[model samples]
Target: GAVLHSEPLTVMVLTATDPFEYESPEHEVKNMLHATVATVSQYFHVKVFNINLKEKFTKKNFIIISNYFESKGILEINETSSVLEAAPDQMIEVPNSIIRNANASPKICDIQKGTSGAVFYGVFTLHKKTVNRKNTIYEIKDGSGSIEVVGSGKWHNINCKEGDKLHLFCFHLKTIDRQPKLVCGEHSFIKISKR
Candidate 1:
């Protein structure tokens, strides 16, 4: 008998710019990348892949990552991937509903779960930035709300440009010195709604 289980496939996005992703409209590359995959679910050391994109994600590295987690990976890629197949002919159109179902702008005061995951979507005036460094705590003001986000130093690898209306998915939150802050570590999601 074959045992088939429906497991949630892991999907991730990285880098400042890419061709197909919203970050890049066309095949314009902007940043290099390195990623760590905690591929295995049980207990194995984290696998780190030094994925240098050179410019965007070269199809070669694209396949590399696509297969990186073979022991725990779920994505499949080959000659048929859109990156190299299906005539590769045009820019796909995104629906307005997809775009409009954007950021979560709940009042900052309601993000009081202290431990529950929170979504903060608003204009982010970055009072801080990240290039690298562990102790660098960042603070941003989102309209009437403001909070600092914690980064995991080197691997946090964020292009934290100032003043971006972003969708900050707070997977983990912490109250530091009585101030609420979200840990923008590897698993958290941060989206730039505005350039």
Candidate 2:
């Protein structure tokens, strides 16, 4: 039977200040304004309102959710105070129950085999391709040392240049050929920022 799914949708707020406008060919006067939005899986532009009365999510770029409905390709955010902003680092930290071991740190040199949920921060130095194309590998380093990280699924979809700063948490430590490597899977979170 045909039905409507009203499950709420969560998105990452991607724009600051004003919503961006797009021009159309048919009606030069009827432009469309949209707020850039993203999720861990994908990104899209949406139209939002009632945003002027609350704290704007410029710093955190955290989660914003609304009742599921789409007009054309854009989603309209009509709920008041739907945008929820918190610490950027907290985005990785909030799901603490998943990390059986909370040995989260930014130093890559401290990583050891069998360590689970180790956090690390570094600049992406190089991107390496895989033989099977099932996963992506990135070479990242803090001033301490560099290590290769294998990211599967949406983790590899992160938009970042080679020099971009990266923050990661909930990755497992493994050894291949006696060298340490970080493996990111379903429970991991990754964030990219300007260097």
Off by over 4 Å in 1: 1-98, 103-107, 112-114, 117-123, 128-133, 155-171, 189-195
128-159: candidate 1 lDDT, tens digit per residue: 66544554455666556667666663325466
- Scored against the true structure, residue 184 in model 1 reaches a CA lDDT of 55
After superposition on all CA atoms, how large is the RMSD of candidate 2? 13.0
Per-residue accuracy of model 2 over 49-150 as CA lDDT, tens digit each = 444512453523566464534643445554432555535553522232322122234566676433544333322444443323677777776666778888
- Compute the lDDT of residue 66 as modeled in candidate 2: 45
Least accurate 10 contiguous residues by lDDT in model 2: 93-102
lDDT of 1 at 122: 38
For model 2, name the residue pairs that clash. Answer: none
- Could you say which candidate leads in TM-score? 2
Count of clashes in candidate 1: 1
What TM-score does each of the candidates earn? Answer: 0.39, 0.40
